[PDB]
Amino acid sequence: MNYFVGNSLGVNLTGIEKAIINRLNLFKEMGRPAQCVFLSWNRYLYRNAQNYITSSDYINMYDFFQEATYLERNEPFDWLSYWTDECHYTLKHVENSHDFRIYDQERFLMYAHFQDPKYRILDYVNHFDSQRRKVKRDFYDVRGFLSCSRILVDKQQTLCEFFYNPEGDTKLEKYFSYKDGKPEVQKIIVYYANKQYFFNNETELGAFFIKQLYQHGDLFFSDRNVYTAPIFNLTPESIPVVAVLHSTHIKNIDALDSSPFKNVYKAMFENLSRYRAIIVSTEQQKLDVEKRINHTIPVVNIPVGYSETIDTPVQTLDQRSVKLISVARYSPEKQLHQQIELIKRLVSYVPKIELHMYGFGSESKKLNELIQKYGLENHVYLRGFLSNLDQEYSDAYLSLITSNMEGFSLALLESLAHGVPVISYDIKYGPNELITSDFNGYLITKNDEDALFDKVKYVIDHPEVQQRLSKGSLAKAQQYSKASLIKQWDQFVRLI
Amino acid sequence: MNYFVGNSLGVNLTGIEKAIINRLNLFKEMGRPAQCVFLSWNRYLYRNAQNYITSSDYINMYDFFQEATYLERNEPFDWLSYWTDECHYTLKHVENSHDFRIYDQERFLMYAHFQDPKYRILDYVNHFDSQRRKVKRDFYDVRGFLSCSRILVDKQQTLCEFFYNPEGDTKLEKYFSYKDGKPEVQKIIVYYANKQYFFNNETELGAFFIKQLYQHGDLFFSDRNVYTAPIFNLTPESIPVVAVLHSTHIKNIDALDSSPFKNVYKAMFENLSRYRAIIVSTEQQKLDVEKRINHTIPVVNIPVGYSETIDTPVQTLDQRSVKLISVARYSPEKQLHQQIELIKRLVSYVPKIELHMYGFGSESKKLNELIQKYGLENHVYLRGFLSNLDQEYSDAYLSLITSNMEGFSLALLESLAHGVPVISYDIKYGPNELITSDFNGYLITKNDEDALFDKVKYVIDHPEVQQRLSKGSLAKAQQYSKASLIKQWDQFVRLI
């Protein structure tokens, strides 16, 4: 059995999360058993994984110990008719919210919070004593069951939390002591195998959990090396684990030799004999990493992404309008302001020009402030993250990348696959390998926005070039075919 | 069903505890159903009640909610062979103790404490985090099961405790906030009837518990009015409760009218309409209480004690030795130093004179310091509390009372029943009613130790008087026959 250990799945899948799900889906078609492992306690992981993987394709560490691994949404429960009718409570609704303040004849007992406005998903219930101190907090799983009660000291500080199975029995206790005004774990108690287990740390918990999963002939893959690497260090070398680096390995990629390893990858680099091999997306990173590693351990380039069959419309270009697209999380590294600037000084040459920015991150408000400021309300659109952008690549003229560090770009390959050529700063890793300037898009010089504006403008000018590049895009997309990577993965696993 | 609500049973039965058990044993022979109710959380109440009542004669409030009402000692468990063999722990024994320090390969996890030296009764286990902070304490019932985990904050302060049933499910949560450097309850959560219940206070818990017990035609009796009276105040008047006063009702018994009610009985006196009637031991206290109450509610004198069949030896007096006896808890009110003094200045007239002081309280060390100081090692004996003093009344010449306030004296009647006359300061209540000077012992003037010494000396001088008084002792013992009180109790219950 092959295990792809990450942290968890977001509401919006991240680059690492999409890469993991891709490995799983290839291993599915290949015929080899595989499973995603998730370490992070997250009571919405059921909802988050529904449109991508089955509850049997994943084990969550906390679910495992909560005997809630492969549990489904149970039947919905009317919490409000329970409280009113059954409990003879009264429910003062909080205004502009899915919240409530529960009372028993003028005794304030609890503050209820729901996710949804239909009041079907109970999020948390907060408990109060005689003097309206918030003593205890009850968190609920999206599948219904009470997952975790947390106990508060002083200023709503976390003293300890208790994780329950869906039947209500305690399976896990965590004891917090406040270091640097933030709750640090100091004791963990795990009820498992009709026995009591003690760990000082969530890492020690991580290690225990792996040793349970592990049978002889099973293989691990560490994908959030921040958390996964420290967990594997406390695991016997007898247990094979393969490092997977999801990005650039060093702080400044221009200083190949005189640069520290990223805080995230420092642990695995320190214990390089622990890992059977290490996997990057790009040939360059295999070469660069192996030199820095000095060939202590084998390195392989298997790309996080692949091209699949296209059974939606490709390159149906309305000759009157020009759709440019960014498909990138709204984070600072992606430098999406430069694209709003580019569209600023480009409307006068191409009016009825549109830029559709697919993603949701932290820079949402900062980005929105510019599209407003420059009057680009009717030309630039902050389209929320969405999977199945196949209908959204159909009328796309170009893809833009203006990030500075990317590693393999999943959104870059996805563009080429839909025959949409991409104009990207010439950075490491990914764009270099995936783009041949004047083959399937252009490599621009880093942060050289005038070069950027010139080529984007040139490409909007001669559609004969867009069509030529759009062809070669599909061509390049094929070298990363689902077959190319099923084999490439199968060969890698067999050698190990 | 008749319920006799107290707090709990000690290792050593108190006057209130013995009085309650007596009521129960009379109601047994009478044929009316009865049960002791105990409010106090005490995990040794099983052991404490074994030689006096059956687990079906008593309901403990916490046992009730812990689904541990009428549970027996389960089979003994080798905690040390569990920890060594099963858990692969190592057990560093603490010297001069039934304690242990549990370790997992040099990780200090828990401090184990047993009651017994056979290491069969596990008392408590204390839990430690990475930095040897005492985070959590596990208390065990004497019947085996984990009763209560307690969670500690700051300086081993109680933040909250969780009460479990023997199967391990949580039945009760208590949340503490520190007022005046001592843990005060502020929230209680009770899992009962497949529902959640909230109380601010242990009194509110007390009231709830009663309303569950109570069926139509059931009768209550409040015997620790400190705790029981406040509990009954929050109970519907529909529920009959009868006050039972176990002592003198006022702070100074000499100030019948210009004296405050005792802190212990203040609550019932404030809510006198709540109680259907009020029961004292002595006729005098019925008269005194009814005048102070102004006859708002009926008062009855039913004595806490009775005389039973004597099938052990009575008055087998070794003519060469003189055994005097105190049968009184070693507390200050009993003034037992005066008896050590009396024996001091009495050895020279009666050498080979013995005083046997049956009791255990707080004054043990203070009392022992005098028997030592005055060289009375071979004449005065601090015999630990013991029930079945029937073999111990056999060679008794006299009983001494030198207390100042007593109410009915159980040990006084018990003396008379064994034909042992008693010499007692002339106090309220009890001695006045039970002793007729020159009938069955003598009433001495309060704290008049020279009068005391004179009569005790006179009675040791003429054994013809001891025999005459010893007869009339048995005579008086009969007026308080088990039959006299079965009837007296039956008449009282029927009128109500």
DSSP A356-373: EEE--STTHHHHHHHHHH
- C-beta separation of A304 from A285 below 8 A: no
CA atoms within 13 A on the CB side of A473: 28
A195: nearest CA in chain B? B87
Query: Cβ separation of B177 and A133 shorter than 8 Å?
Result: yes
Number of CB atoms found within 10 A of residue B330's CB: 21
Whole-angstrom distance, CA of residue A163 vs CA of residue B18:
46
β-strand A322-327 against A396-401: which pairing, if any?
Answer: parallel
Q: How many secondary structure helices (H) and strands (E) does chain B include?
A: 15, 23
d(CA A45, CA A8): 7
Question: Which residues of chain A have a Cβ shorter than 8 Å from any chain B Cβ?
Answer: 86-87, 104, 107, 109, 127-131, 133, 135-136, 151, 153, 159-160, 168-170, 173, 175, 177, 186-187, 189, 195-196, 198, 200-201
**3-state secondary structure (DSSP) of residue A90:** strand
Contacts of B239 by beta carbon, 8 Å cutoff, 6+ apart:
B210, B211, B214, B218, B220, B232
For residues B330 and B338, give the distance between their C-alpha atoms in angstroms, rounded to a whole number: 12
Kind and range of the H or E run holding A60: strand A58-60
Q: Which residues contact A419 (CB under 8 A, 6 or more apart)?
A: A310, A314, A315, A470, A471, A473, A474, A477
Please, what is the end-to-end C-alpha distance for chain B in angstroms?
Answer: 13
How many Cβ atoms sit within 10 Å of the Cβ of residue A274?
A: 18
Q: Which residue among A151, A175, A200 sits closest to B160, beta carbon to beta carbon?
A: A151
In whole angstroms, give the CA distance from residue B480 to residue B483: 8
The method of structure determination was X-ray
Residues from B contacting A (CB-CB < 8 Å) are: 86-87, 104, 107, 109, 127-131, 133, 135-136, 151, 153, 159-160, 168-170, 173, 175, 177, 186-187, 189, 195-196, 198, 200-201
Say if the Cβ atoms of B196 and A87 lie within 8 Å.
yes
Specify the DSSP element, H or E, that contains B6: strand B2-6
Structure token digits, residue B121: 């009764």
| Residue A130 to residue B187: CA distance in whole angstroms | 6
Phi/psi region, residue A67 (left: phi>0; alpha: psi -120 to 50; beta: rest), is: left
Give the number of A-B residue pairs with CB atoms closer than 8 Å: 73
Separation in Å, CA of A167 to nearest CA in chain B: 10
The β-bridge partners of A91 are A102
The answer to whether A128 contacts B87, with C-beta atoms less than 8 Å apart, is: no
Which residues of A are less than 8 Å from B177 in CB distance? Answer: 129, 131, 133
- Residue A305: phi and psi, rounded to 5, are -115, 165
Q: Do A198 and B168 touch (CB under 8 A)?
A: no
Q: Which CATH number does the domain housing residue A342 bear?
A: 3.40.50.2000
Contact A161, A150 (CB under 8 A): yes
Q: Please report residues of B whose CB lies closer than 8 A to that of A131.
A: 177, 186
Radius of gyration of chain B (CA): 26
Specify the pairing of strand A107-114 against strand A122-128. Answer: antiparallel
Q: Do the annotations mark residue B193 as ligand-binding?
A: no
Was B127 annotated as part of a binding site?
Answer: no
Map residue A293 onto helix, strand or coil: helix
**Among candidates A346, A336, A322, A355, which has minimal Cα distance to A401?**
A336
E strands present in A347-467: 353-358, 380-381, 396-401, 422-425, 441-444
Instruction: For residue B111, give the nearest of B86, B92, B95 by alpha carbon.
Output: B92
**How far apart are the CA of B38 and the nearest CA of chain A, in angstroms?**
25
Q: Which two tokens stand for residue A175?
A: 């004891």
As a whole number of angstroms, the distance between CA A93 and CA A102 comes to 9
Give the burial class of A471: count Cβ atoms within 10 A of its Cβ; 0-12 exposed, 13-18 middle, 19 or more buried.
middle
B159–A136: do the CB atoms touch at under 8 Å?
no
Tell me the CA distances in angstroms from B48 to B8, B14, B65, one per residue in order.
9, 12, 20
Alpha-helix residue ranges (DSSP H) falling in B174-332: 202-213, 225-233, 266-270, 283-293
Q: Kindly report the nearest CA distance between residue A185 and chain B, in angstroms.
A: 9
Closest residue of A to B103, CA-based? A198
Q: Which two tokens stand for residue A435?
A: 């783009």
Q: Which domain holds residue B347?
A: 327-483
In this structure, what token pair is assigned to residue B328? 């009184």
Structural tokens at position A157: 């500080």
Return the C-alpha torsion angle A275, A277, A278, A279, nearest 10. -140
Three-state secondary-structure class, residue A68: coil
Residue whose tokens read 């009591």: A196
Helix, strand or coil, per DSSP, at residue A327: strand
Residue B129 with chain A: CB contacts under 8 Å: 175, 177, 186-187, 200
The pairing of beta strand B278-280 with beta strand B241-244:
parallel
> In what order do the strands lie in the sheet containing B299-301?
B58-60, B34-38, B2-6, B219-222, B241-244, B278-280, B299-301
With H, G, I as helix, E, B as strand and everything else as coil, classify residue A346: coil
The candidate with the shortest Cα–Cα distance to B15, out of B451, B385, B468, B487, is B385
List A325's β-bridge partners, or say none: A356, A399
Residue indicated by tokens 């002792």 = B473
Q: Are A52 and A19 in contact (CB under 8 A)?
A: no
Q: Confirm if A158 and A150 have CB atoms less than 8 A apart.
A: yes
Reference A172, options A65, A59, A68, A71; nearest CA is A65
The Cα–Cα gap between A4 and A407 comes to: 19
Can you tell me the distance from the alpha carbon of B125 to that of B110, in angstroms, rounded to the nearest whole number? Answer: 6
- For residues B181 and A37, give the distance between their C-alpha atoms in angstroms, rounded to a whole number: 48
d(CA A318, CA A466): 13
Mutate which of B149, B162, B169, B175 to test chain A, going by most A C-beta atoms within 10 A? B175
Neighbours of B105 (CB within 10 A): 7
Contact A129 B195 (CB under 8 A): no
